[PDB]
Amino acid sequence: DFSMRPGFGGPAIPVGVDVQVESLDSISEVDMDFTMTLYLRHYWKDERLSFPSTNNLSMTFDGRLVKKIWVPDMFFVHSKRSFIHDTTTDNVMLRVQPDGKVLYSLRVTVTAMCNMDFSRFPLDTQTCSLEIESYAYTEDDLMLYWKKGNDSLKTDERISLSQFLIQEFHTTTKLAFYSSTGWYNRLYINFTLRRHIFFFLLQTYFPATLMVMLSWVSFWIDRRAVPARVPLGITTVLTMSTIITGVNASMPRVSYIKAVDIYLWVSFVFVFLSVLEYAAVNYLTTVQERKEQDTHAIDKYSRIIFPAAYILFNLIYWSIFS
Amino acid sequence: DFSMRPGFGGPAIPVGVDVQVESLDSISEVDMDFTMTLYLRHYWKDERLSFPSTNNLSMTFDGRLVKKIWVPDMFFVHSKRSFIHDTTTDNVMLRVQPDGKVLYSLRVTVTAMCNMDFSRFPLDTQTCSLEIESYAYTEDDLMLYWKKGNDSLKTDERISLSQFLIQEFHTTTKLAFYSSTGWYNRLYINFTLRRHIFFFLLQTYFPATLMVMLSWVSFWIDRRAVPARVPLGITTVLTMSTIITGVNASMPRVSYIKAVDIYLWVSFVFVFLSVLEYAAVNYLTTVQERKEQDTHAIDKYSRIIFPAAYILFNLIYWSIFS
Amino acid sequence: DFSMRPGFGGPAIPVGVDVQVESLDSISEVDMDFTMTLYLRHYWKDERLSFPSTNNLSMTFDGRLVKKIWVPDMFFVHSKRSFIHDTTTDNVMLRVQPDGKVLYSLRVTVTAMCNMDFSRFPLDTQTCSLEIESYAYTEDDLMLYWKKGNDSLKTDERISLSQFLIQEFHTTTKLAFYSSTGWYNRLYINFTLRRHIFFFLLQTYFPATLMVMLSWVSFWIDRRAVPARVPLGITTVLTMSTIITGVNASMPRVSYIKAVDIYLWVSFVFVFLSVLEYAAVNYLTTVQERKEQDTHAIDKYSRIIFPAAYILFNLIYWSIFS
Amino acid sequence: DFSMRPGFGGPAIPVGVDVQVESLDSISEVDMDFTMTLYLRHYWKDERLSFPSTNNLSMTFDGRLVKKIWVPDMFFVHSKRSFIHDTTTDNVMLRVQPDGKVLYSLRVTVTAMCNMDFSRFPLDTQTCSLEIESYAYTEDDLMLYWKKGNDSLKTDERISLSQFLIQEFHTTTKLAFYSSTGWYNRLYINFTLRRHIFFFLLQTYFPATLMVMLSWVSFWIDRRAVPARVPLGITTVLTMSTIITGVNASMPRVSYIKAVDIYLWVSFVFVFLSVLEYAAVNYLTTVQERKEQDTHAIDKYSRIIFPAAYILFNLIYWSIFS
Amino acid sequence: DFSMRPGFGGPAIPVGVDVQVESLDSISEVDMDFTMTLYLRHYWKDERLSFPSTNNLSMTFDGRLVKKIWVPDMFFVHSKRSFIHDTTTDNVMLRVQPDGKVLYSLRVTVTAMCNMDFSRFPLDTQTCSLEIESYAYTEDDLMLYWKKGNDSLKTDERISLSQFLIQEFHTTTKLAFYSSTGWYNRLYINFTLRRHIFFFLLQTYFPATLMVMLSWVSFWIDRRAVPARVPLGITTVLTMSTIITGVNASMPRVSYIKAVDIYLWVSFVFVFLSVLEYAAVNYLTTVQERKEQDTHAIDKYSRIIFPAAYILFNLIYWSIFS
């Protein structure tokens, strides 16, 4: 009866796992998941499968036999969707030795969940993993382990992403508990992800800084030139609003406050202050003309105070986000 | 004949349900639905399945047997789409005791409907549920209940969404009626959803307020400076229109009026009034020059009246939406 | 032989239909279709299915039997895609009476075609329908009718759409002809759709009107102030172009002219005329200065003529679209 | 053995085709394909299917028999994807006469490839076709023809697209060759497509023309008014750039130069020239003041030259694209 | 036993491959893959299939037999997804000779991975390939080769893409190694891709250049005209920011720095310098007036220095990217 495991009713069957990674295929920051494609290999012994031959060598069989015999039942924990490839036929392999020792192999694609934190964006670093477990049988019936310890993961040479840098592949194990069903063995594959920071600098931090620097030119123009100092400020506000809106229309739509938001809105406030300043100056000059009938003090103080405050802001900000 | 239920033609079979939630996977505000992934477990007794063994312990069987025996037929009410996972094999488990007591378990993903009301956006709160029912058999043939009352729902530790905060998981029951078919028992899982309000404040309410404050600077500039007071107002109109359009291009495209729309358009009207004001002043000054051949009264009244009206608006608005 | 209908070779079999609507799920204006989810029920008599029991009561059977017996073959006319739900098992029910009277029931989702006309957008009203027909058998073999006349449609209480208002559900029948195959009976479900008009007013008609009103302020400023009257007009053109582009980027991309387009472009022409007007005035004043070496007539006529023409435009436009 | 065709090893079997079109469903300009839904009908004679009855009339059978008998094997040449509808059961019909004459019918949806050329956009016209061929058997085994010549295509009354106008349905035939396999018979359905040109005119050509006309107003303003003639030109450049960007953000993303691109960029150059012109005038006036210590010649020539060149441009352009 | 290959336990079976390409269907630059549709053909000899006939000619069989006999098991290396077409029936062909020589043919669509480098965008050139391999059997059991050397690839006449130009189709072979399973033979199809460069020039490089040229007009306007020289520069900054944002909103979202980015941001810096320049001039003139109570030197130097630097920039840039 191949509807029962080897040693059914006695001790547990040892089963050993080996993996080779083909590609990482895509990543979603909104949905917090990744997609991966791999080969997965299993090893065990089943004397019911032993056959009388002198060759001492394995024999390859088609995947038709897999529906007749007994076979493990691993599954991918915290997956959203997966499948086995089937063109031009099922991507399945079975090899059996005269002893009854079996090798069993599959090609599969999996989408898996990875919780991410974007509060340090674009200076964040993320770490994800893929988890493998037996569905039906508990550690009292099936023993699951990496077939060669640390050497049981292989990774392909041409793996890459158009938006990320990948590093630090390693494996580990853990024992897990369900309240209604029991204890199981679980295997893990781990890796790390990072970004290209200079791209984001050039695209986001650089224009805003130039705009704040442009708002400081106003302190050096003659206060008598009202039709020249009034349009400059409000046009500068317009430009900065355009820039911020542009950045908002292309972000990955996660709805909480991130490191880059703070920089942008602080720059906005600096430009806004620059526009209240000249109103101060104009009003005071005008009342002086009225009262009676050279650079203003607030101009020559602003020329020092504004840049120094911006420099202090930058020091603190990059002390916090490093 | 496993084409008939236990006790077929006599009283009803009691069946008990247990659930554990793996993840919430996505949410659509336009389509008004959510996606969830879970384990679902069933319990019943069927003496046709009893077997002679002394062990007093359950035996695990593969999912091949499920197509041979009789099994419940639960389904998800108000679902749009669902499926059972099948890699590397069907995610199905069957455990049977010498008595004929059965345990039956599945892993599934479901998309379900949840009517939402966005009229208090972004200050809304939504509540959704998942509903479970038997398709074919009525309460005269099958009795459906939670296996352990309030303790029959478990929820995973690492559940989260990139756009929402989740709280308040609990279960309940109700009896339901179809006019052409009869009465059935129904089980429910309920939960609540909320947003991050400070994000939306900073992104939407803050720029508009700054713009209205910028429009009030005009009352303090000398009415004699026409080429300075005329471009300021119309450029301010341009900036506010840009801001409103930016917000309109990223909203979730539900076509009725919401709490935030009102704020934005009232700010627009304030900026517009500021531009009619100086036209009043300019015209009256000009006719006075003509008639004959110091701050104007309408300027020094506007400096008080405009901010006070905006303050009244804010008081009422936040008394209504709280 | 259940490969032949009841009364095969004699008169036609009467089959009666009953329907209950669960939800409308989505709508596409670009593709001109909608998606709906429903229960569908069939009734007929087949003496081959009669069984000797005294109970005078129906017996419920699983969906395994449906592949053995004979069953109708209805299909959805003018559908793009459909399917039957299958979790946790096929959503199929079979009930049979000792007489051989049968009841047969399904749960399904359908996407169906509905030709729409958007030329009165956003003041349009649309009407769609779902059509049911037998595929293989003609009115000489199968007779199809609503089981209870007008009472054979039920609709759920919690149906709604985030973009539309639904009204006027009713059913009817018609006889249809194919040239190569024959005559068939067809059943219909009809309903109507409408929009929220105030949303569209506030978002589209209101800003444009305010802009046209802003362009009329120019007639009251002193013609001597050239650097004040020249930038006002061209900035107003810029603002109106921004607004029109914003509306164009969010419409449902159907490529013919609609009711709202006309309003927007007529407003554009009014703003454009306002800018040619002052050029007239400036040139004539300048040649008068040259010739020789108070409000201009064209100013004080424009102050009357422009608003009156806009009022006439609005009267005609809302007489046409009502 | 229904694993062999009628007359297997002798001459070829004649098979006749009939088609009725239900809808065209969608079109992709980026991917260069369309989607269509139709009924497809086949006719042939097979004496193995003959049965002893006096009725002289056809008998309708369910689609279960189709997997037992022999049946043609047509397929859709240059398709990307297709399928047969299956709700509430397979959309298949089989009718057989006592003679062994058979009729066989299917309902299907197909996506097919159509190479398009957009270089005359939006003044282009496209022509597409659907191709039908036998997969396995060559013209030495199977003869394929339209069952009634030109009368073998029917088209539904309510066919339409939200973006296109459809005309000119007709059928034809051709003989085709594969180098490794042989000669086959092929059938074709052809049709033509066109656009709504006034929509595109109003949305694209009209604003740009108005902007060029606005740039010519500058030649009539007094050269002494520098703060009035300088901002006008650069604001006009800004407006035209906004318009061009708006059009670029909604086009179907095919990356080569089209008829409308040329118009837009030529208008851009005209506006740019207008801004160099006044610089000429200002500089020359200023050096004259310096040298010494009425309308300028370049103004009164520009007033003639610019519009005439634009008129020449339009004549040539519409002589080329008609 | 057709569960074993020809010559099972002896030497390896030679199998020969032939291919014809129907279309390339789509390309993703973000995901770095392409989609292709083809016919694939196999040749081998199996004496178990030999039959006694004098004809010396092949016999065509339906695809029902393929599930009974033994057949190769090729698969597509570095594919993301694939499938075999099945309407109106499986696109499969089997031809067998009295000898036992077999021909076997399929129609399929494949999506395959191709690593791309965009750092020279839009002046890049990409090269991709499709790889074919046997899944289960190693070079000790199956020998895989092109059936006619270089002549075993055919390509269709009407292949094209709306965004790319295709050239240089050829085939090759390589021997490959897996650490846990052995050595295999692999076949390759290679091709090259290129863009339309003039489109990208006109859309991106041309406007920016015109804007830089517009910023140089300021050096020729009279330094006394402050309300004319101040708004020109800041409006020019606004226009250039709009242009850059427009380009950023339509690029294929790969997050590293490319050839075109550099040009755009260098143009931005040139426009920014032009605005600091006049501030220099204004301040120095003003202090001279104060000190005491003709073209400035910095103006007449800028008129030479700015264009020469831009010309040097262009020379170096196009020496690097050619």
Ligand SMILES: C[C@]12CC[C@@H]3c4ccc(O)cc4CC[C@H]3[C@@H]1CC[C@@H]2O
């Ligand atoms: C930097 C921008 C915002 C962030 C965008 C982003 C954000 C996240 C990510 O994974 C990729 C990209 C690519 C395009 C980027 C944008 C291009 C212009 C925009 O300002």
Ligand SMILES: C[C@]12CC[C@@H]3c4ccc(O)cc4CC[C@H]3[C@@H]1CC[C@@H]2O
């Ligand atoms: C706040 C904005 C409008 C509302 C948008 C929204 C709205 C609903 C939602 O669930 C998420 C988001 C994320 C992006 C938000 C946008 C970013 C900028 C824009 O103004």
Ligand SMILES: C[C@]12CC[C@@H]3c4ccc(O)cc4CC[C@H]3[C@@H]1CC[C@@H]2O
């Ligand atoms: C009203 C707008 C154009 C029409 C848009 C539309 C159009 C049709 C529709 O069914 C829904 C919506 C929602 C978003 C709307 C847009 C929001 C801003 C824009 O101006």
Ligand SMILES: C[C@]12CC[C@@H]3c4ccc(O)cc4CC[C@H]3[C@@H]1CC[C@@H]2O
């Ligand atoms: C005309 C526009 C560009 C071309 C766009 C297009 C282009 C091709 C097409 O098949 C449909 C449409 C609809 C929306 C159109 C746009 C609306 C505004 C924009 O300017």
Ligand SMILES: C[C@]12CC[C@@H]3c4ccc(O)cc4CC[C@H]3[C@@H]1CC[C@@H]2O
């Ligand atoms: C050239 C633009 C940026 C690059 C865009 C692109 C980029 C890559 C690509 O494969 C196609 C296209 C088509 C549309 C292009 C855009 C149209 C306007 C925009 O400036």
Ligand SMILES: *[C@@H]1O[C@H](CO)[C@@H](O)[C@H](O)[C@H]1NC(C)=O
């Ligand atoms: C393999 O089989 C041969 C007999 O053919 C035997 O001599 C040898 O010892 C075997 N080796 C192993 C490792 O079992």
Ligand SMILES: *[C@@H]1O[C@H](CO)[C@@H](O)[C@H](O)[C@H]1NC(C)=O
């Ligand atoms: C379990 O079975 C044993 C016999 O093996 C018996 O002694 C014991 O009472 C049983 N326990 C229960 C709870 O049925």
Ligand SMILES: *[C@@H]1O[C@H](CO)[C@@H](O)[C@H](O)[C@H]1NC(C)=O
């Ligand atoms: C139902 O069956 C009972 C016998 O059990 C009979 O007396 C009664 O008349 C039947 N009713 C109908 C409506 O057939």
Ligand SMILES: *[C@@H]1O[C@H](CO)[C@@H](O)[C@H](O)[C@H]1NC(C)=O
């Ligand atoms: C049809 O069959 C009848 C016999 O029932 C015969 O008289 C008649 O000629 C037949 N007609 C044709 C067209 O075969």
Ligand SMILES: *[C@@H]1O[C@H](CO)[C@@H](O)[C@H](O)[C@H]1NC(C)=O
């Ligand atoms: C083909 O078969 C004929 C016998 O029918 C034989 O005479 C001829 O030589 C054969 N040709 C080949 C190439 O095998």
Ligand SMILES: CCCCCCCC
């Ligand atoms: C490679 C350009 C980096 C620019 C950094 C600017 C930080 C304000």
Ligand SMILES: CCCCCCCC
């Ligand atoms: C979490 C602190 C946010 C501060 C935002 C300040 C914007 C001016």
Ligand SMILES: CCCCCCCC
């Ligand atoms: C809105 C600016 C007002 C400035 C007033 C300054 C009074 C000292």
Ligand SMILES: CCCCCCCC
């Ligand atoms: C932020 C600058 C303040 C300057 C104050 C000057 C008071 C004389």
Ligand SMILES: CCCCCCCC
């Ligand atoms: C964290 C910033 C909150 C800003 C609130 C502004 C409300 C007008």
Ligand SMILES: CCCCCCCC
């Ligand atoms: C439902 C009341 C809407 C009021 C909108 C007012 C816009 C100025």
